[PDB]
Amino acid sequence: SKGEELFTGVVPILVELDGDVNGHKFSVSGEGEGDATYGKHTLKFICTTGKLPVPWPTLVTTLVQCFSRYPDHMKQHDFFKSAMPEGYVQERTIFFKDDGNYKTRAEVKFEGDTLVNRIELKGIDFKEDGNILGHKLEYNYNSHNVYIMADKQKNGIKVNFKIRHNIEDGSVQLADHYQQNTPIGDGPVLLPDNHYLSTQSALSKDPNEKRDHMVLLEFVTAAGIT
Ligand SMILES: [Mg+2]
Ligand SMILES: [Mg+2]
Known part of the structure; x- marks a missing residue:
């Protein structure tokens, strides 16, 4: 399709x-590849401005749900690919419990044969010795369910x-x-029935990289319609 x-x-x-978190300005660049057939993508991210002022894990969700594997029987519910190549705007508010929040705006679209995710991130009201600005987060990542519903009006x-x-x-x-x-x-785009994406992510380091960086391996599969 x-x-x-x-x-x-x-x-x-x-x-x-x-990004800008509590006035700490930074940039991140990532490169890699995705194979939606297998719900798989791999990327290496570098902080191009120096040290990242927030923990890497806090940026994972912000840093391409078009690479999710949609089972054949759910293909009519894959909004993300249906909007390509022109793309979609992805906006979030991320509330860190008992701490600050991120607001993000991204455009995800093709530029030639490459899928590009371009993001502006703004974080405010973080605690200086909270888990984010105090860097108290472990370098790991849990598996989640991402719940999706249609917004026909939008x-x-x-x-x-x-x-x-x-x-x-x-x-x-x-x-x-x-x-x-x-x-x-x-x-036109595919407006989905309620369903979810099941995610898993592995964070690692490039042993030959001296810049502040994150290597990510992610697998995502749509589910919840039988
Ligand atoms: Mg196929
Ligand atoms: Mg533990």
Whole structure:
């Protein structure tokens, strides 16, 4: 189908983020590839401005749900690919419990044969010795369910989920995600029935990289319709 046909093979991915958290300005660039056939993508991210002022794990959700594997019997519910190549706007508010919040605006679209995620991130009202600005988050990542519903009035989707970030003392830092996606182009898109994406993510380091960086391996599969 339109859009989906662009994802049958391996697709290069570029991610570019500019961020400001409590006045700490930074940029991140990522490169990698995705194979939606297998719900798989791999990326390496670099902080191009120096040291990242927030923990890497807090940026994972912000840093391409078009690479999710939609089972054949759910293909009519894949909004993300249906909006391609023109793309979609992905906006979030991320509430860190007992701490500050991120607001993000991204455009995800093809530039030539590459899938590009371009993001502006703004974080405010973080505690200086909270888990975020105090860098108390472990370098790992849990598996989540990402809940999706149609937003027919916006010709898009509404998405909600709760990220669990492990803290170095055994506790959990919750990050409540509220998300909206709307197409950039004016063509038709697939508006889905309620369903979810099951995610899993592995964080690692490149032993040959001296810059502040994150290597990510992610698998995502749509479910919840039988
Ligand atoms: Mg196929
Ligand atoms: Mg633990």
